[PDB]
Design a protein around this ligand. Structure first.
Ligand code: HEM
Length: 446
């Protein structure tokens, strides 16, 4: 007599499964799915069967699964042309995991103090252009700021200066090549696709030249690029330009809209909540009488602003569907999920479970005080996912976001240009961010 399996939601369309109801609003869909069917709930995108894993226990089984059980490969087939064949998430488990392990130390610890200064510098620089007052699209601001700081830190000064223009064009041409038909199709050829391919080729060209020029010279800059040059596999072999190029692109895509979206939300949430705006300004102003400048050591200790970021990430996790292929029958909360099926964690859903986050719809940074529960379940809060494939860039992200917010708020008053309740997540975007017309006003402080 066969074994307990997850409940399946009624079918919808025979060609399409539930994808149309899903695509309408993905957060609503997944919220409804869990509400009706619980922690482990099956639906079907097209032919494929997805099982939504929400709550502490189901989340745990997801993040703690071996790579042999849950494969993250097929999430990113859309990206494989951008990243490169046989490059991270297109490589074989062992080679993949070494490449990821090369990134980890490039994004924490030793280079973090340099990264801080670069980020602060870049924001200071952009602010000098600014009029005494005006009206900006906040999401355009944070997207610029994040790509300038990202690229300076991950790629190096060359890409901010000499290769500024060219890289800009390359990035959008790579960006544009993220079409959903690419994921759906094994397919690759189209007009926008050769533009995507030409851009990858040009970037690898530019990476190769810079390896050689840095080597011809003796400059030893601090960026992920440099550290990937200086890295090696366990057998002593080196990364190729193909591999360095893919790994750097993956890192920039990983961090760009995620950061920029989160930064935008931190400002919006503060701007519609004066009590927290006051707490954060107080902290920032205190920093400046304590350090006199934004410093790596000062960024490490900003509890009020950390806690705001954490709560913004609870209520606005920029990645809302983390997908895996099941490669081996595995069992979650006494139900069996067969190989061939897919399985996905849903931050935006699990973050809104009352038993984990009392009064889930309320914005409350004080959830994360030592008195109150933050990590106490390490698979509740999961904006950076979890387990072996937790965000590498989470420390980088936190410093970047803190740095940007300090400098902006220290120098500039802001206010929303539209009704507070009108700023909403656009759940239709591949990386969830605030809805695109997102106007804000500014005025030099004092
Ligand atoms: C600021 C908000 C950020 C959020 C919410 C975020 C969230 C995530 C999540 C949820 C994953 C795991 C996806 C999965 O398990 O399927 C992930 C992976 C990753 N993130 Fe981020 N990220 C952010 C910023 C960044 C930044 C700034 C970088 C790099 C500069 C970065 C680099 C990465 C990398 C390399 C991975 C892959 C980890 C692996 O699979 O081993 N992230 N991120």
């Amino acid at each position: 007599p066969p074994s307990n399996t997850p409940p399946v939601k009624p079918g919808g369309l025979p060609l399409l499964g539930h994808i149309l109801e899903f695509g309408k609003n993905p957060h609503a869909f997944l919220m409804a799915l869990r509400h009706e069917f619980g922690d482990v709930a099956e639906f079907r995108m097209f032919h494929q069967r997805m099982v939504l894993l929400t709550g502490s226990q189901a989340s745990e089984a997801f993040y703690r699964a071996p790579d042999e059980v849950l494969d993250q490969g097929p999430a990113y087939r859309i990206m494989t042309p951008i990243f490169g064949r046989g490059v991270v998430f297109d490589a074989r488990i062992e080679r993949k995991n070494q490449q990821l392990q090369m990134l980890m130390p490039a994004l924490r610890d030793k280079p973090m103090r340099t990264y801080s200064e670069i980020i602060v510098a870049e924001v200071e620089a952009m602010l000098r252009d600014w009029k005494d007052a005006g009206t900006i699209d906040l999401l355009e601001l944070t997207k610029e700021l994040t790509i300038y700081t990202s690229s300076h830190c991950l790629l190096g000064a060359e890409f901010r200066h000499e290769l500024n223009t060219e890289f800009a064009g390359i990035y959008r041409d790579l960006e544009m090549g993220i079409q959903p038909i690419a994921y759906v199709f094994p397919n690759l050829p189209l007009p926008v696709f050769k533009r995507r391919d030409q851009a990858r080729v040009r970037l690898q060209e530019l990476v190769t030249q810079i390896m050689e020029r840095r080597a011809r010279s003796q400059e030893r800059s601090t960026n992920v690029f440099q550290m990937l040059i200086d890295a090696s596999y366990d057998d002593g072999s080196k990364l190729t330009p193909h591999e360095i190029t893919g790994m750097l692109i993956a890192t920039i895509f990983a961090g760009h809209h995620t950061s920029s979206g989160t930064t935008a939300w931190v400002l919006i949430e503060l701007l519609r909540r004066p009590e927290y705006l006051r707490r954060v300004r107080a902290e920032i102003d205190a920093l400046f009488e304590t350090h006199g400048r934004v410093t790596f050591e000062s960024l490490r200790q900003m509890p009020q602003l950390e806690n705001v970021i954490k709560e913004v990430l609870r209520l606005h996790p920029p990645l809302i569907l983390l997908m895996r292929k099941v490669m081996k029958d595995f069992e979650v909360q006494g139900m069996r999920i067969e190989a061939g099926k897919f399985v996905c964690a849903a931050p935006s859903v699990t973050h809104r479970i009352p038993e984990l986050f009392p009064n889930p719809e309320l914005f409350d940074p004080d959830r994360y005080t030592p008195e109150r529960a933050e990590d106490k379940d390490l698979y509740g809060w999961q904006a950076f996912g979890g387990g072996r494939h937790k965000c590498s860039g989470n420390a980088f992200a936190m410093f970047q976001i803190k740095a940007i917010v300090c400098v902006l708020l220290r120098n500039y008053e802001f206010e929303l240009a539209a009704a507070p309740e009108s700023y909403r997540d656009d759940y239709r975007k591949m990386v969830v961010e605030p809805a695109s017309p997102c106007l804000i006003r500014y005025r030099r402080r004092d």
